Design a protein around this ligand. Structure first.
Ligand code: D3T
Ligand code: SF4
Ligand code: MG
Ligand code: MG
Ligand code: ZN
Lengths: 548, 254, 253, 251
DNA sequence: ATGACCATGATTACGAATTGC
DNA sequence: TTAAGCAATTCGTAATCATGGTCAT
């Protein structure tokens, strides 16, 4: 069942078991047609900017399961006004009302079964996290993290199933009640941590809730010190948990010394769980940790955030961005780093690039990616709509068709880099460095409908003077630079031949064989898409050096 | 030092707007006999090639072949800032970092000195491998533009049938079809309305309308267009100038 | 075959200029005396009726009655390909599956043949009102002006008192009232305005009025007939026929 | 009761269309002499002041001084006015709306419109200052120059040695246009005026693009520049003027 | 001469993808 | 017969609407 069935069958089995052990029968409620959406959470406004002050982070321990098991929320505790009036139940002792308006009964009347299921799931997650705590290997650390992450999905899948209209026993009352409770709880903890930690009570600064993501509140205490910020965050989380029901508990999880809040549900910073060394560099929602963006953007954003947060030198970051722009414009970026992957869908109303690509591959090759497969492509240059400009990276590598470098500069790399460097250097200074001051039109080995039977008049060098009737790589006007252009060409050829040798010898070492031919189709190797590019470029540069 | 003083800015404005959309970055080669610039679109099926001889200009002080990395959008923005009574002059120093454009009005008035930055497009200078075309037809440019427009309104693939001395356009779309059959016309009153077909070879070729929609934009410079067609060689659309041409090279889709 | 040749290509264009915006699909029923076609909007508030006689043709031959229904947006594309010196000619065979439009000149042999695929299974033609309580006539450009002026202030326009044409519209930003009286001393047989029984007071929908006034291209004089609790008649005169619009009023109490 | 009778219906139309884009809510303070109206821009950088005299109306009663507090609604109503029409403003005592009578020479065509009028105008104290430079040039020339130089940059640099120089330095390049006063042509309307101290200010392009929309009331536009005060852009009327106060950019 | 009509930016809407709780 | 939830951003393409350039008048 774990491979051909979703998360509903697990909660169904748990519910049936707990019911059988409690003398209860689950009705066969005919599933309603569908629904649009009910009211979820209330994500706080993200005060954007660059924050060098340590921002503590306080989040809830399994917010929705804690809310469920804290208020006796279940199917078997769901009363209404008529029921409480007929039974004459006292308020606040026998029955309670949720912020959504629904009625439930306290644990004094009947213990639910969703609380028991959630107790089981959180007691499993506790040991799954303890095992990660007592573990050293980073790969095994990630494995135990994935194991823990799958035990908090099911604990949240309980609430999801109670709120899932498509599926058996859809009780939207309980899902709406837990969402209302969560919203009110984050609002109350924001108010409390802004009230207690201020000037009047005897603190240095005014604590401000910088950002909130429905369970967390990134309070900024103002103290530039980091250890003091961690201690204050711990004290604040403890005081807040003091003001809630037993299963609920706020915990100080992390601190962000350099904090860059890009937008809503999008930020980055340094993970400080210890006041002596940062753990990692987070990237929430940014185009680097996404999958519908070429890996070049990911690498560039990683390096830029490393230079800005870890090393704190914006000048080097801007220089690297300029170098990357120059590489993009001059076709100095490998095809492997310009590959965008998108998950195919069954039906498409608005045509998409990967859908049309898969259709063209089926029409051309003989078989294409079915639904659910991640189709990868690059954006070739053209005039028509973008969905008509997308090609298999192997087809591009074979046919040598040019890549739309301006597209990758403006549509892929411009916006994320701008959004991450603007809070530091301003909007205009950040956008100025994205002007196209240089271009390299390849127009090479593209023999096709028109790119065939065309000449290259071989204009002069360093001046492009068409009056090159006199033979030689230079015209009589700028002949005084005949000792520098040769140096440039020769050093280009040197770099290219060194790289070519390294790549092909490396391919032979990988193939294990030396006396045999290496015909490798592995397109997931970084050196793939690069050996052929370097071979072509070295061929052209050597043919250019042969003019002297 | 290049100093190309024109006679009227509208000439150069139309020259640029004729192909500012298909291509966007060109290399203008100001040599010792005028200006010449060729480029190819990103689809690599359209090749624009412009030649303005020194006769079209009024003054030409360029003594050393210089190159200008023109971005057509910025240059069109600059040219839109010109009047219809100005003698636009393009000036450039020895090593050009920027180009100067002066729309000095004939009557003593406000001179308009704009300094447009230049780039280095680092592209190759191409040239068509010539061949005796199968049919070199001449046709009034306005009629050709109207034909392309109303036909492309239907479908996205226009076909040309040059047979038995009657130029024929056909287009088969989803909503229907459209077939224009113009006979070879000749008259003494209107020299522009002149169509003289060549029976050298019958030509049945189909081009994408997405490129003819850009070809027909340079229809204001030349009152008549010369279309050279060949079943193997790529078709040519020549818009003749006062001392040059704005000829496009298009290849039938296949 | 079906041979219907218009005197000028620019006639069919203006004829369809009224349909294109409001009418989605229409089945043209050809006869031996001319062409007629009707349709109703998807909301069933406005009814269009086309009547084109032979007198607006240089030659007509429709021996057998024909019935073809197509799209106006696609047909308008075909009609826009017509020069001001060409002659339109509808061409359809027996039981047509597609219509053929033909443009020809008179000094240079230029044949422009366009095909157009054509059926909604609906040929409901119903007209009931033949007597209205008031009849008026005014320039087509003047009425459209008042209509588009009043539509800016509200979503409805109320049009009739003794010997006066009143146009009133009340909305959020304010109100607007235009009162036009028939007598004019201009002595021009076109910009004149006539009015001929019982007071009429009915409010219509602006959007429908905007779609109706777009028929001002067919002629230079539109007649408006009003009748309480009856769809008004918005007719545009034509040399051999007319294009009349039947817009139903709104319940006001 | 306030009852104005515009000489031409197109007059008030051009008057409102010259500034209906940079401001949304204005108060028309109508008095015995005429109507005064001023308001700040939505971004609070552009100040406009409207002045109309009794000399531009065929009949102007204005019994009591009343304040007329949406430029969009006024423009939508004024759009109905045709050429052969005499727009008549009508305001009662303490009004909540306003009648705009579009009468015609032919008394068989009458069109009246009512427009619902609360604006808390932060009334500023405008005062005639002694500006460093006082020039005047044709309105079509200035509008053309601004439309030209605004494409190159968002900021425009404007007089040294009795000669103005419009310069705009952007990213795609820079543009320069020289300016010399002259009255050589018999017609003066195409003449350039200029009068004390060198001045070099820089204004945002967008506000200049909104101001040049006032090139529909007069064929000339006067410019008064001061290094320590916002500029003065005024278009002359037969019975008043419509002036603009633009705050320059930072140095 | 006056808007007419075609062409060209702003603005809105929604599909599609992915990630954040 | 079977499928956890919602909130949020970003990008592409179309539809619609304001506004200017040029033409029959
Ligand atoms: C990830 C995820 C989360 N939710 C909801 C449910 C409540 C909130 C809290 O989620 P969170 O990942 O931060 O972790 P959390 O459990 O709250 O806390 P701890 O790691 O125990 O401290 O988000 C969900 O419905 N489906 C999901 O897949
Ligand atoms: S490209 Fe990769 S898989 Fe192929 S030979 Fe080189 S290293 Fe091995
Ligand atoms: Mg949490
Ligand atoms: Mg969270
Ligand atoms: Zn040289």
């Amino acid at each position: 069942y774990l491979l051909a069935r979703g998360q509903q069958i697990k909660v169904v089995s748990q519910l049936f078991r707990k019911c059988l052990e409690i003398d209860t029968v689950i009705p066969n409620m005919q599933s309603q047609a569908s629904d649009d959406q009910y009211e979820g959470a209330t994500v706080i406004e993200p005060i954007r900017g660059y924050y060098d002050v340590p921002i503590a982070t306080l989040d809830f321990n399994s917010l929705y399961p804690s809310i469920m098991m804290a208020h006796n929320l279940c199917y078997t505790t769901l009363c209404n006004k008529a029921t409480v009036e007929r039974l004459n139940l006292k308020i606040d002792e026998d029955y309670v009302i949720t912020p959504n308006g629904d009625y439930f009964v306290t644990t004094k009347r009947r213990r639910g079964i969703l609380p028991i299921i959630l107790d089981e799931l959180i007691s499993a997650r506790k040991r799954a996290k303890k095992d990660l705590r007592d573990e050293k290997d980073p790969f095994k650390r990630d494995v135990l993290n994935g194991r823990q992450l799958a035990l908090k999905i099911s604990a949240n899948s309980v609430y999801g199933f109670t709120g899932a209209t498509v599926g058996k026993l859809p009780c939207l009352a309980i899902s709406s009640s837990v969402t209302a409770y969560g919203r009110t709880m984050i609002l109350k903890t924001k108010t409390a941590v802004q009230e207690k930690y201020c000037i009047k009570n005897g603190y240095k600064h005014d604590a401000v809730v910088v950002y909130g993501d429905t369970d967390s509140v990134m309070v900024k205490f103002g103290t530039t010190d980091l250890k003091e910020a961690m201690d204050l965050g711990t004290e604040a989380a403890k005081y807040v948990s003091t003001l809630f029901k037993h299963p609920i508990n706020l915990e100080f999880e992390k601190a962000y010394f350099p904090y860059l809040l890009i937008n809503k549900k999008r930020y980055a910073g340094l993970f400080w769980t210890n006041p002596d060394k940062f753990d990692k560099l987070d990237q929430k929602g940014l185009a680097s940790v996404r999958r519908d963006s070429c890996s070049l953007v990911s690498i560039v954003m990683n390096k830029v955030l490393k230079k800005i947060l870890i090393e704190r030198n914006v000048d080097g970051a801007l220089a690297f961005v300029r170098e990357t722009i120059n590489d993009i414009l001059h076709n100095r970026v490998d095809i492997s780093k310009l590959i965008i992957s998108k998950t195919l869908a069954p039906n498409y109303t608005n045509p998409q690039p990967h859908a049309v690509l898969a259709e063209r591959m089926k029409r051309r090759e003989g078989v294409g990616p079915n639904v659910g497969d991640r189709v990868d492509y690059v954006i070739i240059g053209g005039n028509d709509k973008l969905y008509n400009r997308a090609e298999d990276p192997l087809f591009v590598l074979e046919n040598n068709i040019q890549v739309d470098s301006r597209y990758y500069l403006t549509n892929q790399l411009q916006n994320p880099i701008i959004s991450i460097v603007a809070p530091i250097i301003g909007d205009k200074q950040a956008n100025g460095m994205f002007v196209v001051k240089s271009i390299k039109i390849n127009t090479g080995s593209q023999k096709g409908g028109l790119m065939s039977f065309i000449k290259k008049v071989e204009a002069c060098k360093s001046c492009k003077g068409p009056l090159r009737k006199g033979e030689g790589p230079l015209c009589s006007n700028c002949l005084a630079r005949s000792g520098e252009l040769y140096i440039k060409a020769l050093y280009d050829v040197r770099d290219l031949e060194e790289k070519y040798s390294r790549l092909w010898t490396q391919c032979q070492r990988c193939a294990g064989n030396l006396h045999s031919e290496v015909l490798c189709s592995n397109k997931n190797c970084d050196i793939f898409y690069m050996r052929v590019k370097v071979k072509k470029e070295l061929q052209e540069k050597v043919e250019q050096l042969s003019k002297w | 030092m290049l100093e190309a003083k024109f006679e009227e800015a509208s000439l150069f404005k139309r020259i640029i707007d004729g192909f500012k959309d298909c291509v966007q970055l060109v290399n203008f080669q100001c040599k010792e006999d005028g200006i010449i610039a060729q480029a190819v679109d990103d689809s690599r099926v359209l090749l624009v090639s412009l030649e303005i001889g020194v006769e079209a200009f009024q003054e030409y002080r360029c003594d050393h072949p210089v190159t200008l990395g023109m971005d057509l959008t910025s240059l069109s923005k600059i040219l839109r800032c010109g009047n219809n009574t100005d003698t636009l002059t393009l000036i450039a120093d020895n090593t050009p970092d920027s180009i100067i454009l002066l729309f000095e009005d004939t009557k003593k008035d406000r001179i308009a000195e704009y300094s447009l930055k230049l780039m280095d497009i680092d592209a190759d200078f191409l040239k068509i491998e010539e061949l005796q075309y199968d049919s070199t037809l001449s046709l009034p440019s306005s009629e050709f533009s109207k034909i392309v427009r109303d036909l492309s309104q239907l479908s996205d693939s226009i076909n040309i049938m040059i047979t038995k001395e009657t130029i024929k356009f056909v287009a088969d779309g989803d909503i229907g079809s459209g077939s224009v059959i113009i006979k070879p016309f000749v008259d003494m009153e209107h020299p522009e309305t002149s169509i003289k077909l060549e029976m050298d070879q019958p030509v049945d070729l189909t081009f994408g309308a997405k490129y003819l929609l850009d070809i027909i934009k340079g229809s204001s410079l030349s009152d008549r267009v010369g279309i050279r067609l060949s079943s193997e060689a790529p078709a040519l659309f020549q818009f003749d100038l006062k001392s040059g041409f704005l000829q496009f090279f298009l290849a039938p889709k296949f």
